[PDB]
Amino acid sequence: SEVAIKMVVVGNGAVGKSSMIQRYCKGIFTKDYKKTIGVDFLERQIQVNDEDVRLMLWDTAGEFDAITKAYYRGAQACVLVFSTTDRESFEAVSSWREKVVAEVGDIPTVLVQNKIDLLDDSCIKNEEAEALAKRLKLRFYRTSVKEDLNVNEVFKYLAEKYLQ
Numbered sequence: 484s485e486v487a488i489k490m491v492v493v494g495n496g497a498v499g500k501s502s503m504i505q506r507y508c509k510g511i512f513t514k515d516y517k518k519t520i521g522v523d524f525l526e527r528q529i530q531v532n533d534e535d536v537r538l539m540l541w542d543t544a545g546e547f548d549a550i551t552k553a554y555y556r557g558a559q560a561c562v563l564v565f566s567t568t569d570r571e572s573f574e575a576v577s578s579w580r581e582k583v584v585a586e587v588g589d590i591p592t593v594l595v596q597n598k599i600d601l602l603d604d605s606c607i608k609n610e611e612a613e614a615l616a617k618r619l620k621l622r623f624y625r626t627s628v629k630e631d632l633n634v635n636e637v638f639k640y641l642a643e644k645y646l647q
């Protein structure tokens with residue numbers, strides 16, 4: 484048998500949420516300005532602690548109350564994403580954490596700074612990001628979906644945290 488885990492990936496527009504889901508589940512990254520997923524989630528079968536696990540990664544479309552409720556319904560873990568090159572996306576992180584708690588509760592959550600390959604154009608100081616993760620008591624990953632750096636670790640950690 485297998486354990487199914489619904490995970491939500493949230494954050495401001497263009498931080499790389501759709502790309503992150505496509506990378507993890509399909510192993511691909513294209514150079515398009517915006518990535519789209521035409522179904523509610525992509526999935527990947529993995530092994531965690533000698534258990535078959537079906538991860539279902541739900542991608543946001545962009546919300547009205549019923550849309551928000553359907554997206555978060557039954558969510559079991561959360562990736563909170565901001566972008567190295569988008570200051571507003573970083574400043575919104577605390578509000579995203581509050582929003583996920585409001586919509587589903589205090590589910591296992593990880594903080595991800597995506598686009599770390601664009602470090603020369605970074606709008607975030609390393610110390611600021613570290614302080615935010617410490618204040619929110621969240622594990623923090625610096626990630627590049629484009630270069631496949633610290634993507635797999637995000638989902639493995641959340642799956643382990645959910646099962647443990």
Ligand SMILES: Nc1nc2c(ncn2[C@@H]2O[C@H](COP(=O)(O)OP(=O)(O)O)[C@@H](O)[C@H]2O)c(=O)[nH]1
Nearest residue numbers: 497498499500501502516517518598627628629
């Ligand atoms: N340089 C770089 N671009 C990225 C990375 N991840 C995503 N992008 C690009 O950021 C843009 C927005 O990505 P998308 O997945 O549509 O973001 P979403 O709106 O959060 O779903 C696209 O051009 C992606 O290819 C990354 O790690 N590095």
Ligand SMILES: [Mg+2]
Nearest residue numbers: 500501518543
């Ligand atoms: Mg998207």
